[PDB]
């Protein structure tokens, strides 16, 4: 069997990593010579899953032309998202779940995209279609990918198929879908292992709306509780920054990526402007901003018009 390289997009998500490993397995079990490969660094989320299921991190690669003549794309299809020298190899097949664009083939191929929330959901169909038993080990990676892409079935893109697939895989992998999922999701930005001065600095941008000096920092977690439990220390560091930068307002936006609601911690003179722009009542400088997940589209415009 000519050798094939299977891999997902750049800036690898858990789907791009796990699905590549998963399909490579399926392919090999069907008599081919395939190897899972990644095009970037494996993030914490992915890691937790790889480690939990004792799986080797797919080999890093910069180009494919030098190793093979044909490749298989998973979780993507647009050129920019693919390998660097993609123009120089033949896309044998694509297993994906996104729009189709900036993609084109000179020859026919096995393209299989479905309107589901995760590439793994599709593979799972393919395993059964080819009647190939799924190893406990990999089923977990697949289950991981689904959880990852569907934000634990809470994602707007999640589907009844994704959910039924996750359930099915979680049993085989001998785990509890939601239980394992939360842990994995958590290992994402692991804030529990970060300084209170670190959180207030990650995604922080300063503005000067209405002649007032302001700073809005955001932090994404799968449980606002993890970060609210440390409000004392947060207020401390925030108050410091407010002093050093002579800020009229410092708005920390603690977003729950699962429930799409984000808790706000406003410290400043214009801390009342957060109560106006979002129509809320700050009680301990903490008010739940419902439905707010983006500050560029939901926070900045509503506060600019509040002052």
């Amino acid at each position: 069997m000519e050798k094939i390289l299977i891999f997902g997009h750049q800036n690898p998500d858990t789907d791009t990593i796990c699905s590549a490993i998963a399909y490579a397995d399926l392919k090999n079990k069907l008599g081919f010579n395939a190897e899972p490969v990644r095009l970037g660094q494996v993030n914490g989320e992915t890691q937790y899953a790889l480690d939990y299921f004792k799986q080797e991190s797919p080999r890093l690669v910069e180009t494919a032309a030098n190793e093979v003549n044909g490749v298989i794309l998973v979780d993507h299809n647009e050129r920019q998202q693919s390998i660097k020298d993609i123009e120089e190899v033949q896309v044998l097949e694509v297993i994906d779940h996104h729009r189709i664009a900036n993609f084109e083939t000179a020859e026919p191929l096995y393209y299989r995209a479905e309107p589901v929330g995760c590439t793994a959901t599709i593979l799972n169909k393919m395993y059964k279609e080819n009647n190939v038993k799924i190893e406990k080990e990999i089923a977990g990676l697949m289950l991981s990918a689904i959880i990852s892409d569907s934000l634990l079935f809470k994602s707007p893109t999640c589907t009844d198929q994704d959910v039924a697939a996750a359930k099915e895989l979680a049993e085989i992998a001998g785990v509890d879908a939601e239980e394992y999922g939360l842990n994995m999701l958590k290992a994402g930005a692991d804030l529990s292992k970060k300084t209170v001065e670190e959180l207030i600095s990650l995604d922080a941008k300063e503005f000067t709306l209405g002649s007032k000096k302001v700073e809005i920092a955001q932090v994404n977690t799968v449980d606002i509780e993890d970060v609210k439990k440390r409000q004392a220390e947060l207020e401390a560091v925030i108050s410091k920054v407010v002093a050093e930068k002579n800020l009229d307002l410092f708005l920390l936006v603690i977003t729950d990526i699962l429930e799409n609601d984000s808790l706000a911690l406003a410290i400043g003179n214009e801390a009342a402007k957060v109560e106006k722009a979002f129509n809320v009542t700050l009680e301990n400088n903490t008010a739940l901003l419902k439905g707010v997940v983006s500050r560029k589209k939901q926070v900045v415009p509503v506060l600019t018009d509040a002052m």
Copy 2:
């Protein structure tokens, strides 16, 4: 259910007509509201199949945006091949077997392309995958599509899957794959309903190689037998032409488009030049010219350097 329109490319081939009808059936049996549609005239090959299995010719359409919001594409994906106002509707899904190009979607969709020789081969998988019984009537249309696209399994694109599918469908439809196939393929161009003087003129070009007056006519069939059985009448009309035009050689090249071999019927003084240039032995003025399919590239250059 929102209404959907299912259709193939323009200048409709039997795959584009039958697969559109077939998949609309599958879709309806699964609870949707779909209608098979065509973008052009139904040719003779397709007709024979439609009539044989008592099936109505899918409705002619010029645009879709006015009727529906979503469409399903079968047997194609490149814009130019699709409907006129394709840009104005949403491609819900694509069941196809060609390269992907000049195609792009804003949203995700169900895209399913396989490296087989016919769109119907894929539908057949899909019927079983969804466990839906295939009505005798439509199985025939699917069988037709496969026969049409694979030139009775002789096509270079034909696959083991296409043949296995044709067999399976042929039984259900209660017919003999190759028996019905030939009749259908024949109804395409149809040489059995053409004058012997008509065949020798479809594609006849005269040359004057080496000071000698010559004429080479070509005829493409799916069974040289259909044309050889009428050799008596052929030689009669050829000999007449040879007399009226004072030809030193009239070479009729009867090409079998299935086997890519073409039988030669040479009548003239230089009738031995065909024996030299092709390295053969004329027996009854008929010798099999193996591998010869083009006269511009394979007959003319080898006969010019022979006389």
